[PDB]
Design a protein around this ligand. Sequence first.
Ligand SMILES: *[C@@H]1O[C@H](CO)[C@@H](O)[C@H](O)[C@H]1NC(C)=O
Ligand SMILES: *[C@@H]1O[C@H](CO)[C@@H](O)[C@H](O)[C@H]1NC(C)=O
Ligand SMILES: *[C@@H]1O[C@H](CO)[C@@H](O)[C@H](O)[C@H]1NC(C)=O
Ligand SMILES: *[C@@H]1O[C@H](CO)[C@@H](O)[C@H](O)[C@H]1NC(C)=O
Ligand SMILES: *[C@@H]1O[C@H](CO)[C@@H](O)[C@H](O)[C@H]1NC(C)=O
Lengths: 98, 48, 49, 430, 49, 137
Amino acid sequence: VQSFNGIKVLPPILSETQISGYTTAATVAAMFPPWSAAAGVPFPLNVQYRINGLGVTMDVLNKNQKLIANAFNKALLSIQNGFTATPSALAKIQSVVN
Amino acid sequence: TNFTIAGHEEFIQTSSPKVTIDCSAFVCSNYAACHDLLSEYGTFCDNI
Amino acid sequence: TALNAYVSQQLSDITLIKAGASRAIEKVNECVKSQSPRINFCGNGNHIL
Amino acid sequence: TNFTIAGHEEFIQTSSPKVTIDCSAFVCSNYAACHDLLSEYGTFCDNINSILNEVNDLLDITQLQVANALMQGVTLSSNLNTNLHSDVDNIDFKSLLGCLGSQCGSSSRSPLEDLLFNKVKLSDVGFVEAYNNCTGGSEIRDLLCVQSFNGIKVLPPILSETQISGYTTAATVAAMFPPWSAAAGVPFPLNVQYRINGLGVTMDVLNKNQKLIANAFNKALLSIQNGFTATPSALAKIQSVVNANAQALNSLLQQLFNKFGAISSSLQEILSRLDPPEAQVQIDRLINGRLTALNAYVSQQLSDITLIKAGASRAIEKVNECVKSQSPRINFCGNGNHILSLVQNAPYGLLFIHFSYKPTSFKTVLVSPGLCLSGDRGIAPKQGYFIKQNDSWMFTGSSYYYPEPISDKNVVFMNSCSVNFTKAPFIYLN
Amino acid sequence: NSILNEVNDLLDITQLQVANALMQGVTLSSNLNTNLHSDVDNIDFKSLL
Amino acid sequence: NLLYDSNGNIIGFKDFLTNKTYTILPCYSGRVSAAFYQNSSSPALLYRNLKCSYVLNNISFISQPFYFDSYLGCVLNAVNLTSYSVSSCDLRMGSGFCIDYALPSSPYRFVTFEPFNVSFVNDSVETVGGLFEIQIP
Ligand SMILES: *[C@@H]1O[C@H](CO)[C@@H](O)[C@H](O)[C@H]1NC(C)=O
Ligand SMILES: *[C@@H]1O[C@H](CO)[C@@H](O)[C@H](O)[C@H]1NC(C)=O
Ligand SMILES: *[C@@H]1O[C@H](CO)[C@@H](O)[C@H](O)[C@H]1NC(C)=O
Ligand SMILES: *[C@@H]1O[C@H](CO)[C@@H](O)[C@H](O)[C@H]1NC(C)=O
Ligand SMILES: *[C@@H]1O[C@H](CO)[C@@H](O)[C@H](O)[C@H]1NC(C)=O
């Protein structure tokens, strides 16, 4: 109805398909060589340096590598499951359209 | 003594719907008596 | 007059989006694609990735 | 394997023309009967002048913040502002240097800045000379002074372009001579070696290749000057500012020729064909229409002046972190590998010159993420990898292929091995 | 009246963002301060509390 | 018999009598900037982009004993003291100029405006054979 009165919304230059493809390359660049998103540092080895910045004995992180990998899996599933009942971020996304 | 790993989320707005409006369709669609008066202003419409 | 009031609000709305867009670029370059030594910027205190 | 030095330009707008408009002369030129109806809108005219003065105050405070950052902790020698020489350590910088002190004429701009002001006619000095050479003379049909007689005049900023050029000059000298108040107190040739060393380049390769680095800055600086003959992206943004302001002034001036549909567009013919009892209605519709154009014009200035402070704030942070100091931030000053950045004066903004580390050749080599010695030990390299040549493990850089013996300076120490650490019980360390 | 509502709403959100940074990762003990324990390292900080 | 331009302005005229061609040019309808202190008898005037000869002859019919032509235009009721510099100006006129008031010649002084300066040191700039002079605190 607004289109017949001169109010029309135009699509942007880059579609959401091309934008989603750009974010995928950024994630892959931090898991496989040459690690273009981690300064040439492997992903499981870069986490130990980030935690060491706060100050921790590296002998514990080197021994508990299995507990670290299982911890990231629980964090990702918690974010994915949280986007179903009442997301905090999606509540602000709806305000942009409204 | 013991530690784990947590995870949060954050959304930042980057884009916005692009709206385009014209003069000859909002003031009066196809009224000839109105276009002769609306066009008298001139630059007042072109700035929008 | 209503059209002049709408474009006036549109100019003020895009300015806040432009400021928020610049903040997202810093997080991509200094929190995602790199590990900046800045504290309390990427997350909340203890930050890893 | 083989690298060089590249260049890049960047223009950031930090200023805007200061336009001042009067309420009376724009609507009522000289007619006494016109001012009678305008007296009923006395409060409306006071709000227009307050908005324009508010915008001019924002341009005055932002210009002082630019000069404050360029004049923050700058120390020069006494026997220096006497037109000294240049080209320190075979690095030609005479294009980025203007008058060494105040021992010159009126103009004290560097030769590189002259190529920018010569391509912009409506500069700070341009509006001054334009308004002067239009009161008589030979030809006064220019549209610049026609708006001046109708109530549209552009005032010059607080600090002239000569004083701004002198501020940017002192920032360059502070990074080339003692006590080096622009690089935390380190020599200029030595500071470049530490920046390249932080990217993963060995220190010994920078000493033997001093002539290659010195000639690289000279070639990069001469290449950034020859590009001004064409139309680059930096000059395009400068030419767009003067064209955008000129269009807004001409569009507002065209409102004086709009009839607004009452009897006509001009007020002189209204008083000559209509009686006073019916002339008050025709003039009132012109005043109400013209005041709407001024109300809409001052509203666009408030929205446009906000984006100027947003871009100017980025220039202030860039000078204090990329020019006056070396910030540890990454992907902020330039693109990836960053070494040095300089600031130069530009019409309605600033001009930045960024130098980057650009490799030319490559070489595939097998590297290892980490390894541990015998006895449940552990080591890991930093800013480099581990390569094995002639059946012997050695350390190498992350940005230059140069085998180095494994020492206690380029690696870290651990207390246990890892699952993906290669076993090599042959390296001995103390 | 609508625009004035969105203007006041932005000031309310900004008010909470400033208070959030002040109370981001703050831990205190049971034995408190401010006329309970002060004057550390012979430095007078009572005027700031 | 009439010359015009794109934006509907008259810029030419030919006479029906003996052939003499002319042109139409606008007339001066500008303003004047006055700098007034907290307490003074008369403020200092400033006619921007106007010479002192055109002001005291066409737009002003009164006699002013003090007159001075500056880079920004003719300045009235002020003295030429551009050789002096200040850093706490309150009446800014632009282009690096200022107007200062001094209680007891006009009390207003037309001076420059330098809000920032460089801290100079008496050390040398040329090496002494591999050594430099640095002021260490
Ligand atoms: C830490 O907590 C995890 C999960 O509850 C547990 O598996 C682990 O044994 C704990 N470690 C210590 C040292 O208590
Ligand atoms: C790098 O390139 C320059 C110029 O092309 C050349 O003179 C130099 O020998 C090269 N260095 C190596 C190690 O190949
Ligand atoms: C250092 O010791 C002196 C004497 O015991 C004491 O007065 C002062 O407060 C101490 N400084 C501290 C605890 O920071
Ligand atoms: C002006 O020029 C025209 C051109 O032929 C001529 O006819 C006319 O007589 C001239 N005017 C006078 C006053 O002679
Ligand atoms: C004002 O004084 C300066 C310096 O004494 C001089 O250069 C300038 O010509 C003077 N202006 C006049 C005389 O109009």
